[PDB]
Amino acid sequence: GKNIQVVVRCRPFNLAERKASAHSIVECDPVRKEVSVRTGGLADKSSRKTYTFDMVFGASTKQIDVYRSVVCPILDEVIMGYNCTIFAYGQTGTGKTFTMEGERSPNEEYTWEEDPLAGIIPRTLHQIFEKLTDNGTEFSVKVSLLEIYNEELFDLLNPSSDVSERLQMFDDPRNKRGVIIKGLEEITVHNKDEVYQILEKGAAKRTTAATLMNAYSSRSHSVFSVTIHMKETTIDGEELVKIGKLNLVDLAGSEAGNINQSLLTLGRVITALVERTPHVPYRESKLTRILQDSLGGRTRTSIIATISPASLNLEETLSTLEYAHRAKNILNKPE
Ligand SMILES: Nc1ncnc2c1ncn2[C@@H]1O[C@H](COP(=O)(O)OP(=O)(O)O)[C@@H](O)[C@H]1O
Ligand SMILES: CC(=O)N1CCc2c([nH]c3ccc(C)cc23)[C@H]1c1cccc(O)c1
Ligand SMILES: [Cl-]
Ligand SMILES: [Mg+2]
C-alpha cells in the first residue's frame, strides 16, 4: 500500500445457512476498517479475532458502492496509461463472481448500464466509454477472457475455438515481465452497445467448458482483461498516447493441488510487493506469470477478499481473512 489495497466484502446470509441454523459470527466495522470473527466454539464472548484492512464492506454494501470505493481510483490509473489488477478472492459462494460480474435484476426492469446488480466488469466497460467519450479521447477498447483450469489455459472469447483447446504461453522477447498467450482472442468493443452481447458469449462458452470438460468455474481462475488505446489531444496543450490495462480476476474457490499452489504463490507475490522484498515468485504459477506485468508497479492492485457471515463457514472465513492479512500486514489499532 497505498498501491496494494486489501479490502473485505461480507455477503448476506444465504438460504443454506438459514436452514442449517447458522449464526452470525462476523462484524464489519467500515469506519475502523475492521472485521471481527467470533471463534465462539464453547467460548463467548471469548474469541473474537479482529483484522484490519484498507476497507471493509458489510453484507448490505451495494454493487455501486464497491465500484466507487475500489474500482474508480484504479480505473483513473488505468486511463492514465497504467496497468492494474483487481482480484476477487474467497470461498466458493461468498460472492467472487457477484462482485466481478454481477447479475441482472428481476427484470426486465433495468438496462444493463443501470442494473444495480451489475458487477465490476460491466460497470468498468460502461465507464470507460462514458469517460473517454465525454472528454473526447480517441480510444479503442479490446477485451480478452481466459480461464486457468488445472494449469491449462482456455480462451472463452474465441468463437470458432472449441472449449477443449488449450492455449500456449511463451515469454515475451521485447518484455521480460511479459508473456505471450498465443491465439488469445482479443475482441474489439466498438461501442458500449457491443459490451453486453460480448459478455453473454463469454459466459456461454464458460458454461460449455464446464458441461463438457467438467471445468467448473468453482475450481478455475477467470481473467477478464481490458486494454484501452488512448490518444488525447489539446490545442496549446499536450498530446498523450497512452495504453491502459485492467485485469479483473475472479479466482478459484479458496476452499486441485494446482489451485492451492497457484493461490498461495499469488499470496506470496502480493506480500513480497507490499514488503518490497527483492524476490517475488512470479514464475511459480501460471496465474502470476500471466499477471506479472500488471503487478510490480507503478500499478494499483486491489484484492477483494469475500467472506460469508455464517458460523457454518468459520474455518474458510478465517482462512480467507488470514490469507488477506498475510498478503498485506495491516495492524489492529487501539479501540
Ligand atoms: N454482496 C452480496 N450481496 C448480495 N448477494 C450476494 C453477495 N455476494 C454473493 N451473493 C449471492 O451469493 C450467491 C453466490 O455468489 P457467487 O457470485 O457464485 O460467489 P462465488 O463467485 O464466490 O461462487 C449468488 O446468488 C449471489 O447473488
Ligand atoms: C446474465 C448476467 O447477469 N450478465 C450477462 C453476462 C455477464 C455479466 N457480467 C459479466 C462479467 C464477465 C463475463 C465474462 C460475463 C459477464 C452479467 C451482467 C452484465 C451487465 C450488467 C448486469 O447487471 C449483469
Ligand atoms: Cl495484528
Ligand atoms: Mg463464482
SSE string, helix = H, strand = E?
Answer: EHEEEEHEHHEEEEEHEEHHEH
Determine Rg (CA atoms, Å): 20 Å
- The CATH architecture would be 3-Layer(aba) Sandwich
- Give the count of structural domains: 1
- The CATH class, by name, is Alpha Beta
The CATH topology assignment is Kinesin
Q: Please, what is the oligomeric state? A: monomer
Span of the ends, CA to CA? 23 Å
Count of β-strands? 14
Number of helices: 8
Say which molecules are bound, naming each kind only once: adenosine-5'-diphosphate, the ligand CC(=O)N1CCc2c([nH]c3ccc(C)cc23)[C@H]1c1cccc(O)c1, chloride ion, magnesium ion
Largest sheet: 9 strands, mixed
- State the CATH superfamily name: Kinesin motor domain
| Beta-strand content estimate | 25-35%
How much helical structure, as a percent, in the residues? 25-40%
Net shape: globular
Structural class: alpha/beta
What does this protein structure show overall?
- Motor protein required for establishing a bipolar spindle and thus contributing to chromosome congression during mitosis. Required in non-mitotic cells for transport of secretory proteins from the Golgi complex to the cell surface.
- ATP binds at residues 90-97.
- This is Kinesin-like protein KIF11.
- It is found in: Cytoplasm; Cytoplasm, Cytoskeleton, Spindle pole.
- Residues 3-330 form the Kinesin motor domain.
- The PDB classes it as motor protein.
- It contains eight helices and 14 strands.
- It has 335 residues and is an alpha/beta fold.
- The protein has a single domain (1-335), classed as Kinesin (3-Layer(aba) Sandwich).
- The strands form three sheets. Strands 1, 5, 6, 7, 8, 11, 12, 13 and 14 form a nine-stranded mixed sheet that branches. It has a three-stranded antiparallel sheet with strand order 2-3-4, with helices on one face.
- Strand 9 (168-172) and strand 10 (175-182) form a beta hairpin.
- Helix 6 (257-275) packs parallel to helix 8.
- It starts with a strand and ends in an 8-residue tail after the last helix.
- The relative contact order is 0.22.
- Chloride ion is lined by residues 331-332.
